[PDB]
Amino acid sequence: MPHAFKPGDLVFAKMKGYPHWPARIDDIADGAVKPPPNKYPIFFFGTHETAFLGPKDLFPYDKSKDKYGKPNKRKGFNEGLWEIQNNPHASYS
């Protein structure tokens, strides 16, 4: 059975006006800004951007990839597909 989300989990993450996007739950570095309560720091593959999202907008990657893991015209999306499949745990700093 599922646990709560944890750093390193792979997802597609949804935000308004954007397709379901390949992403991971990030750690918070010592000294870094902490997320709001009940939100997680989401790192978006390809764009390398970060947003704070709650579980309603996080779809586990294994279950969802068949629906959401197809090429998209949006900037960064296809690079992000490569990252989540091929090196989802690397430093992209």
Q: Is 83 exposed, middle or buried (0-12, 13-18, 19+ CB in 10 A)?
A: buried
Nearest residue to 47 via CA among 10, 25, 21: 21
Q: How many CB atoms lie within 10 A of CB 62?
A: 8
Which domains, from first to last, does the chain contain? 10-28+38-85 (2.30.30.140)
Rounded Cα distance between 89 and 24, Å, is 8
The number of residues making up the chain comes to 93
C-alpha 91/C-alpha 75 separation (Å) is 20
Beta strand 40-44 with 10-13 is: unpaired
Closest to 8 measured CA to CA, from 89, 80, 79:
89
Where do runs of H (alpha helix) occur along the chain? 61-68, 77-86
State this model's resolution in angstroms: 1.6
